[PDB]
């Protein structure tokens, strides 16, 4: 009952070494391992499709059969490194294989990762939510028996259990240096929140990381992982063993269709001057008035351009707007417009997500009493948008952490000895009614809500909307209200309403969503003419600051820079136009000067 030779594994191990023997061919993989030797890491990365090219059969065997095939490949890798350099190979107990390239059907998402892929390689894509602490895991424990003068081993691998006494009951003292340990971390992936239907339940998939793969991930990172999906011992829990992890850029790209691109290009080229206002009017058509607000909200979705400097200064491109206004005004309605339209937005309340709240938090699992650093709403909106309602009712700790993320777009945490620093760059669109209703237009907005005089400085814009009891204004609104209410769809007999569904000039919201998604990729840059013009205006606001809203300050200057940047993105104009600075300046004047 002791295996002697495996012809299949022999051939498979040989074929991998032949594949890694990239000398007569283009030399790419020989150069890789040479770089691997120089770089001192022990995990080669491999494009699966090249393996398909050299051997489709073996590549099929690898994808269909993971655990055995990789073990052969690691063997071929270790021998190959030993061929190039024996001593460097001898430094490391083992070596690892990293897969890459196109995975035809094995490239799935956590929603679509069914049990059918068990023991098959899978290339999952998603967002990391829960992270566990780095821990060292024993694999090969080495023991010494002074009674017998004997040294033994015990591997664990996939497999009271710890041996401490000889079979003769002599003591065994472990040999820590001889034994083998490896850092080990667990995380959880979920489907990207933008592309995740509300009807379906969450489908979260565990992940195991070891060796250098441990720390190459944090919560709120858009990552693609390639690994072997395996069950666990007992209805069985199932986990994915990572073979390689890579952080896809959160920018990604606006795939869509070329027809959408062409329609966008035609629409953009149609009327670049009115595209901003045409979008603005069609941004929230159900809502009447608040035209500056609609213009402002469009700029927030467009977003400025983040500037990372030589010293590491990281002037944010995100724009932040706060809405204050009397109840029964279309504030909550406006945000739901943003949720329907924003390419990547997350809703939230004052209280935030359960337990974790708005920002990240540490969570004992309570199934094993294990710490888990769990991403919050703010982090998940990174390079996106967050819509906060009842923002006044935000808790005090959140009122503390909001300062960090607003200042830095970055939430740090050291609680429970868990050092971490999560990217949280996210334009925020907060809304909060005045306390006790009936805003007094005498004191500060802080005096009506209590924002501690700082977050108002942090917010680039702050718009007040009061229920002025003008009969003309009420007629305009009520005319709009009844016009929408009286509307019936084109195909209908003024009879039945819509069925009780079991599932959840003017431009389409989706068309708007696709358009602004395309526009976000544009990277418009300054013009000296506009730069001179805006400097005059900012100084002019400082001149207009003599009368005494918050005063114009350097925060206001960069706010105008982002707004002109935003309007530049609206027209796809890679050079900021004086029109862009013009529209921003008047918009800011409305914000501070009614």
Partner 1 sequence: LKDYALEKEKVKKFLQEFYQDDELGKKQFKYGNQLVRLAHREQVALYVDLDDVAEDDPELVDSICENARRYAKLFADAVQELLPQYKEREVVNKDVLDVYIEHRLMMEQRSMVRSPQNQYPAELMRRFELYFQGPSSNKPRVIREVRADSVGKLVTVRGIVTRVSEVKPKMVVATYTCDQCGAETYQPIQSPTFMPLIMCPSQECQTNRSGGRLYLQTRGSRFIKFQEMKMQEHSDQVPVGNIPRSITVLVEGENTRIAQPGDHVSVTGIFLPILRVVQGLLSETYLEAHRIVKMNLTREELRQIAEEDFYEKLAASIAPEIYGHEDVKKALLLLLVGGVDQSKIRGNINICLMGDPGVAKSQLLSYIDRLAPRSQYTTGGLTAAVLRLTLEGGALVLADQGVCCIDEFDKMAEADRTAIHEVMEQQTISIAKAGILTTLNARCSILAAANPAYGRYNPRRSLEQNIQLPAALLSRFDLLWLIQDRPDRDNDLRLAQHITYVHQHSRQPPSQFEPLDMKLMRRYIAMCREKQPMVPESLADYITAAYVEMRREAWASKDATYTSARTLLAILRLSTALARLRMVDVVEKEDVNEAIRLMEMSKDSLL
Ligand X SMILES: Nc1ncnc2c1ncn2[C@@H]1O[C@H](COP(=O)(O)OP(=O)(O)O)[C@@H](O)[C@H]1O
Ligand Y SMILES: Nc1ncnc2c1ncn2[C@@H]1O[C@H](COP(=O)(O)OP(=O)(O)OP(=O)(O)O)[C@@H](O)[C@H]1O
* β-bridge mates for residue 389, sequence order: 349
Q: How far apart are CA 578 and CA 533, in angstroms?
A: 7
**Sole binder of its own copies in the list 91, 114, 151, 473 (CB under 8 A):** 151
Closest CB to its own copies among 175 and 183?
175
Closest CB to ligand Y among 497 and 554?
554
| 435 part of the interface to ligand X, by CB under 6 A | no
Q: How far apart are CA 435 and CA 325, in angstroms?
A: 10
What residue 147 binds from partner 1, Mg ion, ligand Y, none (CB within 5 to 8 A, per partner kind)?
Answer: partner 1
CB of 434 to ligand X, least distance (A): 10
| 408 part of the interface to Mg ion, by CB under 5 A | no
Q: Report the 3 state secondary structure along 351-381.
A: CCECCCECCCEEEECCCCCCEEEECCHHHHC
Within 8 A by CB and 6+ apart from 268, the residues are: 275, 571, 572
Q: How far apart are CA 297 and CA 334, in angstroms?
A: 9
Q: How far apart are CA 192 and CA 345, in angstroms?
A: 11
Q: How far apart are CA 37 and CA 85, in angstroms?
A: 8
Q: How far apart are CA 360 and CA 356, in angstroms?
A: 6
| 177 part of the interface to partner 1, by CB under 8 A | yes
- From residue 204, give the alpha-carbon distance in Å to each of 121, 127, 200, 201, 346: 18, 10, 12, 9, 18
Closest CB to Mg ion among 341 and 530?
341
- Asked whether residue 333 is marked as a ligand-binding residue, the answer is yes
**Sole binder of partner 1 in the list 282, 553, 573, 589 (CB under 8 A):** 553
- Asked whether residue 258 is marked as a ligand-binding residue, the answer is no
| 457 part of the interface to Mg ion, by CB under 5 A | no
CB of 554 to ligand Y, least distance (A): 4
- Residue 89: both structure tokens together: 């190979």
Within 8 A by CB and 6+ apart from 136, the residues are: 181, 182, 183, 184
| 94 part of the interface to its own copies, by CB under 8 A | no
- Asked whether residue 375 is marked as a ligand-binding residue, the answer is yes
SS3 325: strand
- Residue 308: both structure tokens together: 């990372």
CB of 307 to partner 1, least distance (A): 5
Q: How far apart are CA 227 and CA 243, in angstroms?
A: 4
CB of 334 to ligand X, least distance (A): 7
| 166 part of the interface to its own copies, by CB under 8 A | no
SS3 32: helix
| 12 part of the interface to partner 1, by CB under 8 A | no
Backbone phi, psi, residue 367, to 5°: -90, -30
- Asked whether residue 334 is marked as a ligand-binding residue, the answer is no
**Sole binder of its own copies in the list 38, 87, 115, 149 (CB under 8 A):** 149
Kind of pairing, strands 385-389 and 345-349?
A: parallel
Within 8 A by CB and 6+ apart from 202, the residues are: 190, 191
What residue 151 binds from ligand Y, Mg ion, its own copies, none (CB within 5 to 8 A, per partner kind)?
Answer: its own copies
**Sole binder of partner 1 in the list 9, 82, 139, 466 (CB under 8 A):** 139
- Asked whether residue 94 is marked as a ligand-binding residue, the answer is no
| 3 part of the interface to its own copies, by CB under 8 A | yes
Q: How far apart are CA 446 and CA 455, in angstroms?
A: 9
| 285 part of the interface to ligand X, by CB under 6 A | no
Closest CB to ligand X among 43 and 281?
281
**Sole binder of ligand X in the list 71, 261, 477, 522 (CB under 6 A):** 477
Q: How far apart are CA 555 and CA 451, in angstroms?
A: 17
Closest CB to Mg ion among 4 and 554?
554
| 142 part of the interface to its own copies, by CB under 8 A | yes
Closest CB to ligand Y: residue number: 554
Backbone phi, psi, residue 472, to 5°: -65, -45
Closest CB to partner 1 among 253 and 311?
311
What residue 150 binds from ligand Y, its own copies, partner 1, none (CB within 5 to 8 A, per partner kind)?
Answer: its own copies
Q: How far apart are CA 511 and CA 24, in angstroms?
A: 52
# of chain residues touching ligand Y (CB under 6 A): 3
| 363 part of the interface to ligand Y, by CB under 6 A | no
Kind of pairing, strands 121-131 and 371-374?
A: antiparallel
# of chain residues touching partner 1 (CB under 8 A): 67
Closest CB to Mg ion among 240 and 552?
552
Q: Enumerate residues 326-365 that contact Mg ion by CB under 5 A.
A: 332
In contact, 208 and 239? CB cutoff 8 Å: yes
**Sole binder of ligand X in the list 1, 253, 328, 548 (CB under 6 A):** 328
Backbone phi, psi, residue 494, to 5°: 55, 35
Q: How far apart are CA 349 and CA 352, in angstroms?
A: 5
- Asked whether residue 345 is marked as a ligand-binding residue, the answer is no
Site string for ligand Y, 445-474 (x = CB under 6 A): ------------x-----------------
What residue 477 binds from ligand X, ligand Y, partner 1, none (CB within 5 to 8 A, per partner kind)?
Answer: ligand X
Closest CB to ligand X among 182 and 288?
288
- State the residues that interact with Mg ion by CB under 5 A: 332
Q: Which segments are annotated as binding site for ADP?
A: 333, 373-375, 377
Residues of the shown chain interacting with its own copies in the complex, contacts defined by CB under 8 A: 1-8, 142, 148-155, 163
Binding site for ligand Y (CB under 6 A): 457, 554-555
Annotated binding-site positions for ATP: 503
Could you list the residues that contact ligand X (CB under 6 A)?
287-289, 327-333, 433, 477, 480-481
């Amino acid at each position: 009952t002791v295996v002697l030779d495996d012809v299949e594994l022999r051939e498979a191990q040989r074929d991998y070494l032949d594949f890694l023997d990239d000398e007569e061919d283009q030399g790419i993989y020989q150069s890789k391992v040479r770089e691997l030797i120089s770089d001192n890491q022990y995990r080669l990365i491999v494009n699966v499709n090249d393996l398909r090219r050299k051997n489709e059969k073996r590549a099929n065997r690898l994808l269909n059969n993971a655990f055995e095939e990789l073990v052969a490949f690691q063997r071929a890798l270790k021998d190959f490194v030993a061929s190039i350099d024996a001593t460097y190979a001898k430094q490391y107990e083992e070596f690892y294989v990293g897969l890459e390239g196109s995975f035809g059907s094995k490239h799935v998402s956590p929603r679509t990762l069914t049990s059918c892929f068990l023991s098959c390689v899978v290339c999952v894509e998603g967002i990391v939510t829960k992270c566990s602490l780095v821990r060292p895991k024993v694999v090969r424990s080495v023991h010494y028996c002074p009674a017998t003068k004997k040294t033994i081993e015990r591997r664990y691998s996939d497999l009271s259990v710890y041996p401490t006494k000889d079979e003769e009951n002599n003591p065994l003292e472990t040999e820590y240096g001889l034994s083998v340990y490896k850092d080990h971390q667990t995380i959880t992936i979920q489907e990207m929140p933008e592309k995740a239907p509300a009807g379906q339940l969450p489908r979260s998939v565990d992940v195991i990381l070891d060796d250098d793969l441990v720390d190459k991930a944090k919560p709120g990172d858009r990552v693609q992982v390639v690994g072997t999906y395996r069950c666990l011992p007992g209805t069985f829990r199932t986990v994915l063993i990572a073979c390689n992890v890579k952080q896809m850029s959160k920018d990604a790209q606006p795939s869509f269709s070329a027809e959408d691109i062409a329609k966008i290009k035609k629409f953009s080229k149609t009327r670049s001057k009115d595209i901003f206002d045409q979008l603005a009017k069609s941004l929230a058509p159900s809502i009447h008035g608040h035209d500056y607000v609609k213009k402002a909200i469009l700029c927030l979705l467009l977003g400025g351009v983040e500037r990372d400097l030589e010293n590491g200064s990281h002037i944010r491109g995100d724009i932040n707007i706060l809405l204050i206004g009397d109840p029964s005004v279309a504030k909550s309605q406006l945000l739901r417009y943003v949720l329907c339209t924003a390419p990547r937005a997350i809703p939230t309340t004052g209280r935030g997500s359960s337990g974790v709240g708005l920002t990240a938090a540490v969570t004992t699992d309570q199934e094993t009493g294990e710490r888990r650093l769990e991403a919050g709403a703010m982090v998940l909106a990174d390079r996106g948008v967050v819509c906060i309602d009842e923002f006044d009712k935000m808790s005090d700790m959140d009122r503390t952490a909001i300062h960090e993320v607003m200042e830095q777009g970055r939430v740090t945490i050291a609680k429970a000895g868990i050092h971490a620093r999560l990217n949280a760059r996210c334009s925020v669109l907060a809304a909060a009614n005045p306390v006790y209703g009936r805003y007094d237009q005498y004191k500060t907005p802080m005096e009506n809500i209590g924002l501690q005089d700082s977050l108002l400085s942090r917010f680039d814009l702050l718009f007040i909307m009061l229920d002025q009891m003008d009969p003309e204004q009420d007629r305009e609104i009520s005319d709009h209200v009844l016009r929408m209410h009286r509307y019936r769809a084109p195909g209908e007999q003024d009879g039945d309403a819509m069925p009780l569904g079991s599932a959840v000039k003017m431009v389409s919201a989706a068309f708007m969503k696709k358009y602004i998604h395309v526009a976000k990729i544009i990277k418009p840059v300054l013009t000296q003419e506009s730069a001179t013009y805006i400097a005059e205006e900012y100084s002019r606001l400082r001149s207009q600051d003599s009368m005494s809203t918050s005063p114009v300050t350097a925060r206001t200057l960069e706010t105008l820079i982002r707004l002109a940047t935003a309007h530049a993105k609206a027209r796809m104009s890679k050079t900021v136009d004086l029109q862009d600075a013009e529209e921003a300046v008047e918009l800011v004047q409305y914000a501070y000067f009614k």
